[PDB]
Design a binder for this molecule. Sequence first.
Ligand SMILES: COC(=O)c1ccc2c(c1)NC(=O)/C2=C(\Nc1ccc(N(C)C(=O)CN2CCN(C)CC2)cc1)c1ccccc1
Length: 287
Amino acid sequence: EDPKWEFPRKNLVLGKTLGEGEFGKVVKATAFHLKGRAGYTTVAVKMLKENASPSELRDLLSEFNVLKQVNHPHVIKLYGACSQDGPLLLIVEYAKYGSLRGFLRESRKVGPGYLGDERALTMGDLISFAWQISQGMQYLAEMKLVHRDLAARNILVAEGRKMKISDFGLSRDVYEEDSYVKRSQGRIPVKWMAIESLFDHIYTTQSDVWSFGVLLWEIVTLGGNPYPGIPPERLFNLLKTGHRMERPDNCSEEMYRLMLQCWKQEPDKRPVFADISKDLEKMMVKR
Ligand SMILES: COC(=O)c1ccc2c(c1)NC(=O)/C2=C(\Nc1ccc(N(C)C(=O)CN2CCN(C)CC2)cc1)c1ccccc1
């Protein structure tokens, strides 16, 4: 019911489903006189499914709450909400290329594809994508937020192939003690979770770093599936015994070193996002 965000329901027109997010459906839409931009502006709208649970409603409200506060070139934007005359709707930035996972998988088969024109991809483009994400995460970490669900499916690729971190439904503030801890089992897919989150239910910026490492692996494999062929229940023993994903095919030694650093068992031995950004900057420049 926030005046600064509430948008007239009659000014919003919903269209096709773009996909489904962790708490609901995302549809393409158009908004008339959005934040005083004349005419219609193409947007996306996040809504709840009819059979929504209280968790899913709470996740929608928590994404709204987080995105009201944050503003960065590599974080997807919140524009407004419709809460009054029917179903709860979040009005968010449209990202024309869809998810990073989708975009990279398409590059295997489409356009000039991966080489080593938005459809032409080089290893420089891939380092750039990772750098943009790291910059967003560095800012979110400064804002004492922990995303918790960092993954290629939760990064969007917008006009100009600009990275936008999205899907904040599981994100949490860590104001005090710099950790988020939950007694109950989490809803993040096991394959992206830091070892201490999996065993101890502890989430910090350093566990986002772990997930960032899994995202780096997804990036260099052009949307590969982590721990391929390994059932999720096996990760408990696999990680505990010090195993990690192997170096992928078109991954440099330096890129793999960075991944391994992100997956250090000891969270304070992992790089912070500021340093990851620095590592990626020197990779882009040593070309
Ligand atoms: C806080 O804000 C958010 O959290 C948030 C979350 C998602 C999106 C968003 C904001 N803003 C967008 O634009 C989003 C998506 N946009 C999109 C755009 C283009 C496509 N593309 C390329 C299609 O081709 C569409 N196509 C997909 C396949 N099906 C079968 C038919 C429709 C697909 C998604 C998208 C939504 C669902 C999941 C993945 C991404």
